[PDB]
Amino acid sequence: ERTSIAVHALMGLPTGQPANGTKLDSIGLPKVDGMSFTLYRVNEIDLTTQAGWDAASKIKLEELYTNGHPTDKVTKVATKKTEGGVAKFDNLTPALYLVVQELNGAEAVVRSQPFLVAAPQTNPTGDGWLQDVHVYPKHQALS
């Protein structure tokens, strides 16, 4: 079996709502189509064993993001463009996936900050592991 990461493209910042690190009902507000996202795998980190989240949890954006750009601490995985406001990645081996929104395109919209998510993720109860990780990163529009 394999793991997969589903990224739901959304536009606009939360409206007084709290940050949720789990599945939530989709707002369904106008999404940004033709959005570019790319996955980068963090080396030395394997979500295959328990020790993996411990080391990974000690990760500092300072190491993956210091000069406003990624370092050698990341490995190129694949670049795909979200279409229809929804993107999905498959054939994912246990590790750490990092999503970066490319500046290219997005003329009426400004590039939002990137987000990081480990895969696979443990179940809400901590029992077993989930084969699919859901993410709802929002974009920041221009003006």
């Binding site: 959304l10 939360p14 709502q17 940050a19 949720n20 690190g21 939530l24 989240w53 990974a56 990760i59 954006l61 750490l96 939002s112 900050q113 987000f115 990081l116 998510v117 480990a118 993720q121 443990t122 901590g126 993410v135 709802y136 990163p137 929002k138």
Partner: peptide, 10 residues
């Protein structure tokens, strides 16, 4: 929460 990384953006 324990498990997770940084996906505050919903």
């Amino acid at each position: 929460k324990n498990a997770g990384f940084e996906l505050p953006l919903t």
